[PDB]
Structures are given as structure tokens and as C-alpha cells.
Nucleic acid binder design. Sequence first.
RNA 1: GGUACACGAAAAACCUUACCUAGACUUGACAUCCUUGGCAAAAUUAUGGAAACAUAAUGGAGGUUAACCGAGUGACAGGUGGUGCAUGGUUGUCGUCAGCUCGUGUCGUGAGAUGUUGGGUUAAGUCCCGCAACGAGCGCAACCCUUAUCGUUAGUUACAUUGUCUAGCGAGACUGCUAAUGCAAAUUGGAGGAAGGAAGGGAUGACGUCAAAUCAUCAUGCCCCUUAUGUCUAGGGCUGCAAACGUGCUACAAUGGCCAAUACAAACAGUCGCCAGCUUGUAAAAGUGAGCAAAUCUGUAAAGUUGGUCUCAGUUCGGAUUGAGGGCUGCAAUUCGUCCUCAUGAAGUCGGAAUCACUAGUAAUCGCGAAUCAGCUAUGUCGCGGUGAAUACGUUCUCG
RNA 2: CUGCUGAUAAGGUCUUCAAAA
Lengths: 86, 60, 129, 155, 104, 232
Amino acid sequence: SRSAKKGAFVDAHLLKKVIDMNKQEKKRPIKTWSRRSTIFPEFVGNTFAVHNGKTFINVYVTDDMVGHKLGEFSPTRNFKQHTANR
Amino acid sequence: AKKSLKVKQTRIPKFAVRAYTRCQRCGRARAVLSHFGVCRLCFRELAYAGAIPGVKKASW
Amino acid sequence: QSYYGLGRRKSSSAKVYLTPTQDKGKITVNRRDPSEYFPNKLVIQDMEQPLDLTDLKKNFDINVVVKGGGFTGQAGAIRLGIVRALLQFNPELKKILKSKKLTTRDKRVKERKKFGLYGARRAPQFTKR
Amino acid sequence: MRKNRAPKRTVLPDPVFNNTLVTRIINVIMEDGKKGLAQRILYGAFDLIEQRTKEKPLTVFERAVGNVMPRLELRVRRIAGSNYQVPTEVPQDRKIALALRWIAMFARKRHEKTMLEKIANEIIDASNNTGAAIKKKDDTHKMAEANKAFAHMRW
Amino acid sequence: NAVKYPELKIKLESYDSTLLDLTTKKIVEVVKGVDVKIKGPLPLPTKKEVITIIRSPHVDKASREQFEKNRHKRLMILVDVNQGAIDSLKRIKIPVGVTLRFSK
Amino acid sequence: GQKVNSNGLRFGINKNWISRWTANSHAQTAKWLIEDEKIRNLFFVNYRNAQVSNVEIERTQATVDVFVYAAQPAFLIGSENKNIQKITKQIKQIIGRTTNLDLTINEIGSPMLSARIIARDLANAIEARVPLRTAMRQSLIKVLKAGANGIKVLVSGRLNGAEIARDKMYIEGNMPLSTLRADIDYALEKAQTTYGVIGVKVWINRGMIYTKGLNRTPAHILHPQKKQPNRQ
RNA sequence: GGUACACGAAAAACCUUACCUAGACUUGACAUCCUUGGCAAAAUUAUGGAAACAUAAUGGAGGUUAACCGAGUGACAGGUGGUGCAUGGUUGUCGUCAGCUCGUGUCGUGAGAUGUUGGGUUAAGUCCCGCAACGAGCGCAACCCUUAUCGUUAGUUACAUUGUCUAGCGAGACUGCUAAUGCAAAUUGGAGGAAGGAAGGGAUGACGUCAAAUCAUCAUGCCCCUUAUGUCUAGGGCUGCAAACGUGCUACAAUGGCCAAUACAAACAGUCGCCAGCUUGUAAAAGUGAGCAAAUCUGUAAAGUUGGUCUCAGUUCGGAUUGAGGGCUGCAAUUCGUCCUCAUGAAGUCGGAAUCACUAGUAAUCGCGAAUCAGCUAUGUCGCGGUGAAUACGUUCUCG
RNA sequence: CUGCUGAUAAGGUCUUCAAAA
Ligand SMILES: [Mg+2]
Ligand SMILES: [Mg+2]
Ligand SMILES: [Mg+2]
Ligand SMILES: [Mg+2]
Ligand SMILES: [Mg+2]
Ligand SMILES: [Mg+2]
Ligand SMILES: [Mg+2]
Ligand SMILES: [Mg+2]
Ligand SMILES: [Mg+2]
Ligand SMILES: [Mg+2]
Ligand SMILES: [Mg+2]
Ligand SMILES: [Mg+2]
Ligand SMILES: [Mg+2]
Ligand SMILES: [Mg+2]
Ligand SMILES: [Mg+2]
Ligand SMILES: [Mg+2]
Ligand SMILES: [Mg+2]
Ligand SMILES: [Mg+2]
Ligand SMILES: [Mg+2]
Ligand SMILES: [Mg+2]
Ligand SMILES: [Mg+2]
Ligand SMILES: [Mg+2]
Ligand SMILES: [Mg+2]
Ligand SMILES: [Mg+2]
Ligand SMILES: [Mg+2]
Ligand SMILES: [Mg+2]
Ligand SMILES: [Mg+2]
Ligand SMILES: [Mg+2]
Ligand SMILES: [Zn+2]
């Protein structure tokens, strides 16, 4: 869907943080709100805490999740069972 | 909350798509006529008062 | 001695030029064969209706200019134009034409859509419960 | 509670066979306001009648409509329970209109190929007093004859 | 004698009609009082804009009224004017509703 | 039921527009439409004691002309033209110093048969705790004595401070509201009472307009002289 | 309920936004009054940052402080917080139905009656007769706009097959003439006429009922909050989902599906736009690039006509759903945009009890345009034209 | 020309005033 000449998209604050934490050996979860950022190849191996709307859900990216959007692996609304009206 | 929203609308945002058109007389956000910059319920009042030149009732 | 007529119908003007000739009428619409201009859906008889019952053996050369409307509207316009030009040749046709009422503007035009209505006169579905 | 009788528009003579019934049945088989399509259907059916019956299409059509054309109508009048029917003589105009409506309705339901052949074969079948519109006319006639008793009381 | 302005195409437009006719009358009167051959004050199709507004403050979208605004338009082209006509034209004082679109 | 605005129904047929200008673009059309509203609202809400019947605004590419018809223009004039400069500076601040202002005060002749000032007097009397029956009766009798046709006054709201809203109407003379030829002047005002808001609507009939045309003529400003200045 | 349910909302990804989570602020994001100086606010570049905001930069238009930029400062600002059963304003409904009243007079102990009922005629309490009533006001009608014929004015950017067309003024239709019957209003028929008896459509909506709707367009009495129910920002939400109803679109098909050629509109809109032509691409579109501030240039008309093919099947119908590759807008398209291509191919073969709209260019049907709009499964709303029907015997029944 | 056809929770606003112009 997204254009070709435009390419992918990251907020680049996430990109700077990812580069820094990749150069650092003792990585920890990266608390990010940018659900719009796509998972770049350099992201692989890190763990992110994405703001689902209320809390920060931890997602561990792999060599496979590369390409999708960062917030796509976390939800925003929860529904599990209805109740009988009558 | 209406005064703060009016003032924020006058103030320029940091993104182009952030900008929306509010009525200039009142502060109504939806149903704004860009030709006149006035919402429908104030356009009716101005037209009935004769403020807008050339805006007469239509018979078709 | 040519004759000129101006008919109208459903917002479609017509300019009909009647020329006296004795080598077949050879009706012509907008420099094109009527059988090709119209869908030839027998609407030709509609425009010939005032030129059939009285006469077309007089072999009037027909020069028609129509700009506007569809094809039935255009046919009605040229019918009215032919009649009105015929009023300029031997006004005795005026009585017979008036008898069957081919010399009156139809006056029927499309109404304007009204707000709250799905059209000129249709109304939304009404639910009571 | 209207106390006004509606006007009537001209029927217009047909510009091919000079028979108004042709224009009437064209308008009856009209759908989506397509005069050209309706006229094509009728004239193709009449040409098929030429090809089959080897007789005059207008004469065959008149023989069909006159035979299908009913005589009595049963008007529903409820008083306490169900409805007791009332046989009344119909005007000629409504008689012809009902004949054409039945012809078209039973023509657009037959099992055959293109509607051209559909209506053509329906007309040729109704020309010999054996058809579906014939069955409809027979049914209403028999129902009126059964309920002949209440003909005196209408309203 | 000189001209200095060939084919001066004055174009008039206004929300009001009668004021437009009066202004065109004054213009043609002055330009005939001076030696200029006016082509003619012809009319052009009037652009009509229609705005539809719901009457009610809250609900009942069905009840809505309409308003119109017409931009009446006239055309008038002068062949040769010269200073003798231009100086007289300077003192016309067209009313505010009328709008000029002089094209030289 | 609901009735269309008497002024709005007659505008563009037998009534000219209170603001007469043609803007450049849609962006400027809103600014010019709001500035005139601010000016008129200023003249009406404040400097009320002068009985300003109506203010008309006339603008070109860059020049603003204001015509203020008032019954007692001495209050606008002030003591040796004092408040005149104050209101001039107020208008200049409202529109802009870059434009040229042409304010013009006009004494309105035969003020009594003007719905705006009749309604303003009604609202002032209501706010001053004057009894309503007496107030409307005196206003109606003075309007009729002024020599006009029927006048209809509708006063609605929390009447006399009551907890249940009522409405009181006085029609005295023929007021054809469906007729378009009639010269009907309609005004509406809000009396801000200690118990809330009272709405006063005054229709006044001033004869029939038998001369076809979009006015372009004064309306009950002409019986005496209508010549006051402050212009250039 | 009728009078809510494609309604407020004529555009919810961010903003809108009023909701939730979280990070920040306190005479405040905005304003006045006062003691007081103006030698700023913006915008942008750095670092910290989810962004609010902080520390440094160019220290800025100007006009000496005019507006605004400040300090001090307490009155206060602020509230889409409650109460539409405290209100103004605006609106729905009975209903464009024909009613609602008043002054004087008279009748009655009185509420009250008369006029307004009675006979004719209308859409009408429209009008005429009668009459203890005589008059009057609002409502009805006409005056207003537009369509139907014509004259005149004007001929470019229309026409230029020469009188269309556009828009100012005017003529025309007035029960005006005639026959019938009625006291008279008036009703019906005929003539001429483009138009005949409210010529078609619109605007126009009486007193009042429903304590009808709106404190969330706006204004406002009263109550409530005042380092928080006020303010800024980031993320989520208004798009959920066993279900039920309303309004619409698409279909179940040969009056048709697909392909090719091709004829005929009106109205409207356009300089962050309409986009002609050309090149590229299976296509959405991209690049180049004229023309147009517009009767000049642009916004492909479709149904329709002809020809070819399918041959009555869950199909060359039907397009839902689903996977993949791309286009555009936008900081950003996952929650949550739409378009194109490829691929898959749910239901559905005319829909139960029961209901809706419509009396001519109407219903049905086919396209075009505009408003809000960066973009939008608006199939919604407001408009325009093309083709273009059937029926009305009558008020027994049904709702009002 | 006589089918059938039953029910509808409680309390409630709304006239302030003529002294008079
Ligand atoms: Mg507010
Ligand atoms: Mg927006
Ligand atoms: Mg629809
Ligand atoms: Mg139902
Ligand atoms: Mg939001
Ligand atoms: Mg400085
Ligand atoms: Mg100083
Ligand atoms: Mg209420
Ligand atoms: Mg009565
Ligand atoms: Mg009596
Ligand atoms: Mg009487
Ligand atoms: Mg009327
Ligand atoms: Mg209520
Ligand atoms: Mg309601
Ligand atoms: Mg409030
Ligand atoms: Mg937010
Ligand atoms: Mg919603
Ligand atoms: Mg085919
Ligand atoms: Mg050209
Ligand atoms: Mg093209
Ligand atoms: Mg074909
Ligand atoms: Mg199946
Ligand atoms: Mg298919
Ligand atoms: Mg998406
Ligand atoms: Mg099948
Ligand atoms: Mg009707
Ligand atoms: Mg029963
Ligand atoms: Mg019981
Ligand atoms: Zn507004």
C-alpha cells in the first residue's frame, strides 16, 4: 500500500535508540509509543514495550517479524465473552 | 472547553494536516461554510439580518 | 420563398427550414440522415405525423438544426418547428393542425428535486413502529 | 370522498399496424422505461408469428386478445368474516386492459427461450383458446358463476 | 488625435441586477456623450450559487431552507477611447456593488 | 407554529442589504463579514442611550464607510466632539489602521416608528422593573400616536420573575405578515432581567410599498431633515 | 411512536474530541481593571526528550509604545459540568388544514350564546343570499421567484446551416366573449389562444396542543469545581460483537453478462485548482506540459443504436470474504483511508405473517455536478438533465 | 346487516394584581 519511492517509516527516535542499544551489549526493554514505526532489520534481537493504550506490552522481535508495524503485535481492545441479556 | 479550542484553532499547529476550520463568529467546528467562514446556524442569522450582501432566499 | 420554424421541447431547440422543392422531400437533421441521427426506433413517424396526414408529396426540402436535449425531445422540437413553419404556408392548415393539437408547446419539463425527498415527488419510506 | 373522475390520456394509434392495442401492449411490457426494447420485443414476436402461423399478425393478435378478454369481475367485499365476492360487468377499456395485463404476466413466466419467443408462443397459444391467460379467465368466470347469488347486493 | 487604448473590454459584475443596469446606463451615456463607438452592453449568463442550510439547531435534518446569490454579469467593449473619453470616464464613480474587470 | 423571519423574507425584494461590499477571495469574505458584525454589535450593545436605529457598512478594496442612523446623536457627538474620537479609534482598532474610515452620523427622522429603538426601549423598561402591562401599553400608544399602521409586540420569558414562562402579545392595527408589499420593520431584543432573559419582538407596519424596486431610498428618515456629519 | 434511528455529524487515522491511560501547568492556553517598564513575541537550528516542556543560539515586524511584549497584583478568567420541568432564540407536529379571536350591540341570574350556525360555490371562515347582529384583526387568496408563447433592447467569449441563445424591460390570460341556469356569487360547455377557469412548481405555515426538541450552535437565571469538573501533549477510543431493528446499495440474470465501434444533455465548479495533449505503465497513476480567473480552457456522459459471443447452468450470474504485488493523500494508513492489478469465488434462483412510496414528464430507470474535504466502501445529502410508463369504476370498508 | 373487539401504576404545575395612567 505505502508508496515505493517513500519507502518504509520510522520516527528515527526509535531508530537512534535501537542503534544505541544494539551497540550496547546489556540490552533492556525499549519503552516506545511509536506504533507507526515499521520493524527494520536492525531491530532484530531487541525487546520493545509498546503502549497498547493503557500499559506497555512487551514484544520480542525476530528475524521473521521484519516488515510489519511495531504496534501490530500488540492489541488495543479486549473482548472475550458476552453475557445473556435475559 | 470552547475558549481553549478556539484559541488553539487560531494558533498555527506544527503539522499542516492538524489545521481545521472553525466558525469565526461562534466556535462551532462541524458544518462550517468555507465560502463564508461561518457555520450554518450563524449564516442563517446573518442572512436574515441582511449582513451578507446578495444572499437572498431562493425560490428556484 | 423559404419558411422558418422554431420548436422546443424538454429544453431542446429546433430550427426548421422548409424549402419548396419537387424532387422528394428528403428530410435531413443536422446534416445527417435521420435514420442514422435517430435510433430509428420508429420515432421518425413522430416527426412526420404533421407532415403525413396533410402532405409531404409537396416535397419540402427540410433543413433541421437541433442543439440540445436527447432524441425524443429533439423529435418533438422538430415536430413543433415543422408545424410552426407550416403556419407560414397556406394558413388553412392551421385549423386542421389545431384540431389534433400539434401546434401547442407541450409545456412539460422536468420538475426540481425537493429536499427531504428522493426525487421530484418520491418520498422516503415511512416506518411507524 | 374524491367526487372527481380522473381524466384519460390518449392511447395513440400504432404507427405500423395502425392498431392502438399494439401500443397498449408495448406500454404493458415496458420495463425500466425502454420503449425501444419493448418495441423490438413486440415486432420480433410478430415476425415470429408470421414465420409460424402464416397468417396476418394483427388478425392473430386480435383473435388472441378477444378470446382472452374476460366478461365478469369479482369485487371483494368483507362484512364479518372472509369476503363474499360480487360479479360486476366491466367497461370495455378495463376489459382490454385486463386482457393485455394477463397476457403479459403469463407470457413473462413461460419456460421457453428469449422473451421474444416467449410472448410470441403465448400469443399463438391464446389464439386457440388454450393457454394460461385462458385458464385465468376460466377461473374467474367459474368463480363468478358460483357466486352469482350475491350479484344483486354490491354496496 | 490618438487612441493609446485599442479594444478596451470593460466587464461588469454584481450581486444586484438593477444597480448593474443603472451603472451600465450611466457608462453608455457618458461614452456616447464622448466620441466612442460602443459595441453594445450585452449580458452574460448569471452564475447562481445555492446554499442549503438546516433550519433547526439540533435535529430534523429534513426541515432545511435554501439561499441564493447571483453574480449578474455584463460585457461592454469600446473600440477607441482616447484621452478625451478616458478623462471623462475617470469621473464616473461606479457604485460599490458593481465590480469592474477592465482588461485593456 | 414557526414563522419565517419578517426581515429575511423581504430581503432582496423590497429591502436593501445592510452591508454592501464585494470581497476578493473566500479568505477575505469571512474577515470582512466578521468585522462588520463586530462594528454593528459595538454600536448596538454600547452607546445604547443614543437610540441608534441602524448602522450600514459599505466597503471597497481598501476603504470602510459607516452610516450610523441615530435618534439622539448628541450622545455620540459628546462634549465638543469628544466621544466621536473615542468611537473612531474603537472602529479603527476593530478593522485596522491600514484602511481609511469614513464614519458618518445621520439623525433619523420620525424615530418613533422604528422597531429597533421601540424594542430597545421595551427592553430597558423591562430591565428597570417597570410593570409590563403599563410598559407595553405606553409603548403601543406612543407608536400609534406617531402616525403609523398596526404594531405587534410579543414579550416572552420568565414573566415578572414567575417560575413558569408565559407570553403576552398586543396587536393594535392591521399587520399583514404574509403580504410582501407591506413595509414591515421587525426587531428583536433581550432584556437581561435579574430573573433571567426576556425576549421582546416588535413588528411595525409602515404602509405599503407601491413603487417597485430594491429600495435604494430612505425608510422613515425623510420626514424631517436627515443631515448630520462627522464624515470627510 | 406518528414528530428518534444515512438524525445533530455539509467528512472521527493525528487535529476534530467533549472519553480513557499516562507525562507536565497554576491570576493560568484566552480577557479586563488597576501601580508599572518596554531595548518582543514568532519562526527555525542544537541537546535532553513519546511529544508536552526545558536548558543555548539568529535576538529580530515594528514604533518608543500604538497593537502588543512584559513585571507586580487581587478582584478573577475558565467549565461541551447539572437543571430544555427556571428561560431567550431556533425547530418538529397537527397542517398549507381552514380555522382562532376581538370591539360595539342583544339574549341569559351565570358559566355562556349571537356574529363563526342555515341555503348555494370553492382548496379555503373563498364569495354571495338569509339572518339580532353590525364590523374588524391574524390565517386563506393576490402581490414575490421560476417554467410555458411573443415583442423590443445587445451581439462577444454566444450564434455564424443566421437567428438559436443568454438577460433587462414589456405584451400576453382577465370567467375577457359566447350558450345553459341562478337573485347573486358562481358552475358546466364552445370559440380564439402557447397557455382556461388556483396553467405547472417554489417561497410563504394563524391562535395554540404535545411542560414536544435543543444549556453540546449561541446567550442566559440558579447550583456545583477553583494547584481542578480548568490547560498542553503522546498513545488508545468514538470503527468492539453471541445478537435484534431502521434506512439504503448490490444481486439472484437472456428486457441479461462480456467485447468493439458510436449518437444525443442540463446545471454546476475551477489558480495549494480544473487539468487538454504527449511519453511511460496490464492499471490505479507518474513525468513533461500548454489553456483557463473562465458563454473562450478543463471536468471522457451513461442508458440508447449496430455488430460479435455466451444458450438458461449456481453459470462468462452474483460479488462478499480472503492472500499477494503496487498508486495517491498525509509527519504517520496496524488498531482505522481509499483506488488498481492478479488470485479465491459465501449467501442468494424473486423472499413468510405483515408493510412503504407514487396521480405526467410523476413512479421506474441511466448518468453528471456541488457543499463540507489533504485523503475517505458517502452506496449518504443537496441539485441537473436522457429514456419514460400503468391506473383512478367508486367511498361499502381502513387511518387521519 | 349483524365474527370477535379486554385493559392503561401514584402525586402534581400554570395566573401573578389593579391599585392606575
Ligand atoms: Mg462557551
Ligand atoms: Mg481536516
Ligand atoms: Mg437514495
Ligand atoms: Mg414495520
Ligand atoms: Mg482524537
Ligand atoms: Mg527592539
Ligand atoms: Mg517608553
Ligand atoms: Mg419544552
Ligand atoms: Mg367555527
Ligand atoms: Mg341564528
Ligand atoms: Mg352569516
Ligand atoms: Mg399565500
Ligand atoms: Mg421534557
Ligand atoms: Mg422530536
Ligand atoms: Mg453552561
Ligand atoms: Mg490526542
Ligand atoms: Mg458514531
Ligand atoms: Mg447481447
Ligand atoms: Mg470555441
Ligand atoms: Mg482524454
Ligand atoms: Mg445492443
Ligand atoms: Mg445456491
Ligand atoms: Mg460477473
Ligand atoms: Mg490499512
Ligand atoms: Mg438460475
Ligand atoms: Mg395530489
Ligand atoms: Mg375473532
Ligand atoms: Mg387487570
Ligand atoms: Zn457559527
